[PDB]
C-alpha cells in the first residue's frame, strides 16, 4: 500500500509552486518532502535522516552511477540528490511525497519504477503568462525572453500523450487549486485513513 507520489510540473510562473504552497499549508500530515542526500559536512544541530542523508562523496558518486537518484545537482561545492528510497520512505509513512521538478526531471521519474501522478499546471496562454510575469515586477526584458521560451517548451511537451495524468489550466488560483485537490482526492483519502 501507500499513497502514490505526486509529480507537479509546468512553467515556472504558471502557478505550480503557489498551488503547492497552498496545498502544503491547507493539509496537515498528508503531504511531505523527501529527505535529500548531501556530501556536505553535517552542520551542528542537524540529525541524519531528518535534515539530510549525510554521505561521503565516494558513496554519492557510486549511488549516482548506480541510478539510485531521481535528480542530483552540485551546489556550493557539494553534491545533493533525491533518492528513490527517500521518496519511498515518505510513501512508507502514509504520506504523499511531492516532487517539484522540471520537464526533463519528469522524464527521469518516468523511466524509474515509481508510480506517481504526473500533473502539469499550465497557463491559459503564453500571453496570459507574460502578463502575470510583468505584473510581479521581478523580470527584465532579457530574462523575460529566456523564461517565455522555456515556458513555451514546457507547454509543447505537455501535449505529449501519456506524459501527464492531469493538466490544469491556471485560469484562477481558486479553481486551479480546486482541480488539483480533485485530482489527488484518491491519494489524499488514503493518507487520511491510518
Swiss-Prot record:
Cellular component, GO annotation: cytosol; mitochondrion; photoreceptor inner segment
- Enzyme class, top EC level, equals transferase
Enzyme Commission number, as recorded: 2.7.4.8
Q: What tissues harbor this protein?
A: Widely expressed.
Compartments reported by the entry: Photoreceptor inner segment; Cytoplasm, Cytosol
Q: Which residues bind ATP?
A: 13-18, 136, 170-171
Q: Which organism is it from?
A: Homo sapiens (Human)
State the UniProt keywords alphabetically.
Answer: Acetylation, ATP-binding, Cytoplasm, Disease variant, Kinase, Mitochondrion, Nucleotide-binding, Transferase
By sequence similarity, the record places it as follows: Belongs to the guanylate kinase family.
Q: What gene is this protein a product of?
A: GUK1
Organism classification: Eukaryota, Metazoa, Chordata, Craniata, Vertebrata
The segment(s) forming the Guanylate kinase-like domain are: 3-185
One annotated GO molecular function is: guanylate kinase activity
Q: What is this protein called?
A: Guanylate kinase
